[PDB]
Ligand binder design. Structure first.
Ligand SMILES: OC[C@H]1O[C@H](O)[C@H](O)[C@@H](O)[C@H]1O
Ligand SMILES: OC[C@H]1O[C@H](O)[C@H](O)[C@@H](O)[C@H]1O
Ligand SMILES: OC[C@H]1O[C@H](O)[C@H](O)[C@@H](O)[C@H]1O
Ligand SMILES: OC[C@H]1O[C@H](O)[C@H](O)[C@@H](O)[C@H]1O
Ligand SMILES: [Ca+2]
Ligand SMILES: [Ca+2]
Ligand SMILES: [Ca+2]
Ligand SMILES: [Ca+2]
Lengths: 121, 121, 121, 121
């Protein structure tokens, strides 16, 4: 299992120690408070009131936690995934990222604390 | 495992099918949007800026998801619990509740969706 | 999880720390060599050639590993059980026992090494 | 998970669907009766009284269940492995084999039933 922090101002994202292999079932739980700019802070689902101005993930709100598995596209994580299997045969290392517009991560603050484990299969 | 919804307006909370027994390890993932009165909505960690005016759980913000195991006191859940083990002596059915001040749930709205399962131990 | 030894000459059985509760899924793996009397030894399935002369469990051979769950009758374990659910209405502490005729354990030797865990549910 | 049978007279062994990846935790439970030649049968720990005359796995008795993981040497399985992690730099598909001397499998009989699953990690 992996336990770590994902900083909201890190545009490259946080590489974890988890490799997602074919057939793996995983569980993620995320908590904490971060902002894409404003003084207010939001949790791992982000800000449902902010429009999408070119987010790295169009299926999650600005300020949400998202991930990539290997060379996949971005996949929403939000507060977590329960006993989840990756669709479409994706595989590889798990990278966690804060959902913002590329080039605008410099004014971001806060972080999420994230647990990832593999389930029985 | 159990999956279900917990309404923000329900002072009685939502009884699940999960009975927590001594030594159990559990994982909970919660998601969704609710409000304790305002037009804005918050996720399962609640509103970090709002004062405690007599919440059912003083260890979580107003608007957070909390639980009871049997006749325990309230326990914060927030966005979830990863491979968690209860304090000594706690046992019984898990009831999920929205954290507000008793008598004031009448202006609350929305709901959280919650998954619970038992882990290997 | 519990790991320990079950001595072949212990007629009372070895009480483990595992309490089997309704809904639990368990895995057991047993190993080792034991005898009910002869100089030869057998593994946890026991001796398929020996007759049942009053065994504490009639559904397993003499010299097999069996168990009781609380006050239940005996249940065969043999080499182990994979992600197993107990009959309804049995619960309580798991006791592990070598299968011999009562009164006749004094000439037994050897032991089984046994591991028990609870699985995801 | 994988469930199947390992035949005592199959010298090549049985390639399963389980790929052991770095960091995996696995559980194997084996049961049944087989022989390496004699009329008598033994369980998955084989025959502790039989000399090693060139076994594929010198770390297990003749008639035991063993495995290979990818490019590994043979590894004893016996009655099973509980929540087991492989040595460093062992990975690949799990092949299960009956322990006998090469060229002497033709007179073997019986089989073991085997369950393999991945555990939480
Ligand atoms: O839409 C995203 C965008 O939102 C605000 O304008 C922030 O100030 C920017 O840094 C950027 O995060
Ligand atoms: O502090 C709790 C309190 O918050 C606001 O005042 C709401 O209008 C009330 O219904 C109550 O929820
Ligand atoms: O069948 C049970 C019986 O088998 C042999 O006779 C042993 O010597 C006895 O002690 C008893 O274990
Ligand atoms: O030691 C191995 C050897 O044991 C006996 O001799 C069997 O007859 C042979 O087929 C071979 O299995
Ligand atoms: Ca920004
Ligand atoms: Ca209210
Ligand atoms: Ca005896
Ligand atoms: Ca042979």
């Amino acid at each position: 299992a992996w336990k770590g922090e994902v900083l909201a101002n890190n545009e490259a994202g946080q590489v974890t120690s988890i490799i997602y292999n074919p057939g793996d079932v995983i569980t993620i739980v995320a908590a904490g408070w971060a902002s894409y700019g404003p003084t207010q802070k939001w949790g791992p689902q982000g800000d449902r009131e902010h429009p999408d101005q070119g987010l790295i993930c169009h299926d999650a709100f600005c300020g949400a936690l998202v991930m990539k598995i290997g060379n996949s596209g971005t996949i929403p994580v939000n507060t977590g995934l329960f006993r989840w299997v990756a669709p479409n045969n994706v595989q590889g290392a798990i990278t966690l990222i804060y959902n913002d517009v590329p080039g605008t991560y410099g004014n971001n603050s806060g972080s999420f604390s994230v647990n990832i484990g593999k389930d029985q299969s």
